[PDB]
Design a binder for this molecule. Structure first.
Ligand SMILES: NC1=NCc2ccccc21
Length: 330
């Protein structure tokens, strides 16, 4: 089997991407944030504290003839930005772009933090990291991909995120028309539950490539590119007036600037992030200070190849017995 679904930016800055997902019988379509940096499929629901729902579409398990309470199971998750959610668990039928999994754990939110409430466009998350990170207790549950894997034509999914435009998540096949040149594959460590890999270095603009190992995660659920302070300083030093602002919480730059590209290595291959991809617009409405899309990972404890990096590539998440990642230009 295979599946293919379009993923769409939630706003004009590509702050996140949403993908429609069918849950239950008859189908209830919710727009979920596909997140290769976590492993829970959770949704706003009829159980979510009413004051914490503001415009989201909810899953109502009592209206699904295939929903079953997973007795005794609860979940609770925190994310890198300090947001969180928790609740109980149903199993139900879940379909993505024509690919169906029966008995998928659908984690129903009883509580969500303010950032989730305030984002009316995201109805929940669909985790695509390794199932070892799934938070369901006392019986850990499998991700949609793990449940689907054995049925797929090939045990893979691909992320093809757009810059200020829709893109695609495919399951079970590689669309050879969706990228240019070849796909370069690179080793993955699953020790921390992430799609963790080692970039071979970087360049800033038309500058020379610096060969250096950068260990990080491919994380579609993180907006920006978080890299070591040395690398980030080298980037922003090429932008007149750019500076790190403690009050704003990262590097900012004059909105009048033209940003240089940023290149990252994948083995001997190179992925080029155009400068425009690194512009996240005014820090507040009407400001001439703009927020940078490349930020320091110092204090996070891990480097993160988030959407800023991934949307410059066609990315293969290869879930074979020994997982690997693939990157192609597009
Ligand atoms: N994977 C994620 N990085 C940041 C974040 C916030 C909210 C949900 C998921 C994520």
């Amino acid at each position: 089997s295979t599946g293919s679904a379009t993923t769409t930016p939630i706003d004009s800055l590509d702050d996140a991407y949403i993908t429609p997902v069918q849950i239950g019988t008859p189908a209830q379509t919710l727009n979920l944030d596909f997140d290769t940096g976590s492993s829970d499929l959770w949704v706003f629901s009829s159980e979510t504290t009413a004051s914490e729902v503001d415009g989201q579409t909810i899953y109502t398990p009592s209206k699904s003839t295939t929903a079953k309470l997973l007795s005794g199971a609860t979940w609770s998750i925190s994310y890198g930005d300090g947001s969180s959610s928790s609740g109980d668990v149903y199993t139900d039928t879940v379909s993505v772009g024509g690919l169906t999994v029966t008995g998928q754990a659908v984690e129903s939110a009883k509580k969500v933090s303010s950032s989730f409430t305030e984002d009316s466009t995201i109805d929940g998350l669909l985790g695509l990291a390794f199932s070892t990170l799934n938070t369901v207790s006392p019986t850990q549950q499998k991700t949609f991909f793990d449940n689907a894997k054995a049925s797929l034509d090939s045990p893979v999914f691909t992320a093809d995120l757009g810059y200020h435009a829709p893109g695609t998540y495919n399951f079970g096949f590689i669309d050879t028309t969706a990228y240019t040149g070849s796909i370069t594959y690179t080793a993955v460590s699953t020790k921390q539950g992430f799609w963790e890999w080692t970039s071979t270095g970087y360049a800033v603009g038309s500058g020379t490539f610096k060969s250096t190992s950068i260990d990080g995660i491919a994380d579609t659920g993180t907006t920006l590119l978080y890299l070591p302070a040395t690398v980030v300083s080298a980037y922003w030093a090429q932008v007149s007036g750019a500076k790190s602002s403690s009050s704003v919480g990262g590097y900012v730059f004059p909105c009048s600037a033209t940003l240089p590209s940023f290149t990252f290595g994948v083995g001997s291959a190179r992925i080029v992030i155009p400068g425009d991809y690194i512009d996240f617009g005014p820090i507040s409405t009407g400001s001439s200070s703009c927020f940078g899309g490349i930020q320091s990972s110092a204090g996070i404890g891990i480097n993160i190849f988030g959407d800023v990096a991934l949307k410059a590539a066609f990315v293969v998440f290869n879930g074979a017995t020994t997982p690997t990642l693939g990157f192609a230009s597009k």
